């Protein structure tokens, strides 16, 4: 019993972290097989960072402009390409610790673990959601760039995020492992701002199902709702609209607790309207939107405490 923001064990990822230096900029990279990936802004000095041209800054570098240390051992660079907003460095050693892995782009609302690193050296692990406005509420200091986000499905590491920058809001922006940003952001120090965000409706509902599976029922009520009547209410409280696809994803959690989705929306409709009455759901005095339905199936018991 219990319910925590749980991250994936990080070992398989720790073995791919390295440090990458260019001039006097140092950040982290990820070493898979014989390639090291990192943000391309590693080739910038502070002056460059306001108006960089990467095509043009990169041709002014050779392989030996890049230092790659893994622990103690120096890795020699023998190749370099730009890929969108990342670099790819071919090196002379293949990483003996390369795990089974793949790269996926994730969708807003989805969730993942972040391994925070400084100077190629893992410092911590925590669990995140990709926000609707495409930021993350991470925790990062200077030198954290090239820290990655991931999931584990069985034996396989799904890399989905690389850290590039921090917004004025204090939130973070980055990239998939192909170099394509999440969001409208660009790797430059200019005026740039998070779009306004929204609460992840699908997730809140997942989290209410988790409360019930754990054996708490107080927030339920006897009503039902039409999808459209819910959405009229959702829009006024800045929630994402619920769609039919979202309703279908909540199927097995519906099946496990015998609560119909639309009954649960009615429950939420009520919580939004009347507050919680200074009470808690799974420990929280607020409605929690950073567990997906999948996050709830994995952590929770397959048997409801009825």
């Amino acid at each position: 019993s219990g319910f925590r923001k749980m991250a994936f064990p990080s070992g398989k990822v720790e073995g791919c972290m390295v440090q990458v230096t260019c001039g006097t900029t140092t950040l982290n990279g990820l070493w898979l097989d014989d390639t090291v990936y990192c943000p391309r802004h590693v080739i910038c000095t502070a002056e460059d960072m306001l108006n960089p041209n990467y095509e043009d800054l990169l041709i002014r570098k050779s392989n030996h402009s890049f230092l790659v240390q893994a622990g103690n051992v120096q890795l020699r660079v023998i190749g370099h390409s730009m890929q969108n907003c990342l670099l790819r460095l071919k090196v002379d050693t293949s990483n003996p610790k390369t795990p089974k892995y793949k790269f996926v782009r994730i969708q807003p609302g989805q969730t993942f673990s972040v391994l925070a690193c400084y100077n190629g050296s893992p410092s911590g692990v925590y669990q995140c959601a990709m926000r609707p406005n495409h930021t993350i509420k991470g925790s990062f200091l200077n030198g954290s760039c090239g820290s990655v986000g991931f999931n584990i499905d069985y034996d396989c590491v799904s890399f989905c995020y690389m850290h590039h920058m921090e917004l004025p809001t204090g939130v973070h922006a980055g990239t998939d492992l192909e170099g394509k940003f999440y969001g409208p952001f660009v790797d430059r120090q200019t005026a740039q701002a998070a779009g306004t965000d929204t609460t992840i409706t699908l997730n809140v509902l997942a989290w209410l199902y988790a409360a019930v599976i754990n054996g708490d029922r107080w927030f339920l009520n006897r009503f039902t709702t039409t999808l459209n009547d819910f959405n009229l209410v959702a829009m006024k409280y800045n929630y994402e609209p619920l769609t039919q696809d979202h309703v279908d994803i909540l199927g097995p959690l519906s099946a496990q607790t015998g609560i119909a989705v639309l009954d649960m929306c009615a429950a939420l409709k009520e919580l939004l309207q009347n507050g919680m009455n200074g009470r808690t759901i799974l420990g929280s005095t607020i409605l929690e939107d950073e567990f997906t339905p999948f996050d709830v199936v994995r952590q929770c018991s397959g048997v409801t405490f009825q």
């Binding site: 910038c44 954290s144 850290h163 920058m165 917004l167 004025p168 120090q189 200019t190």
Partner: peptide, 5 residues
């Protein structure tokens, strides 16, 4: 502004 890290 914006801070690359």
């Amino acid at each position: 502004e914006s801070t690359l890290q």
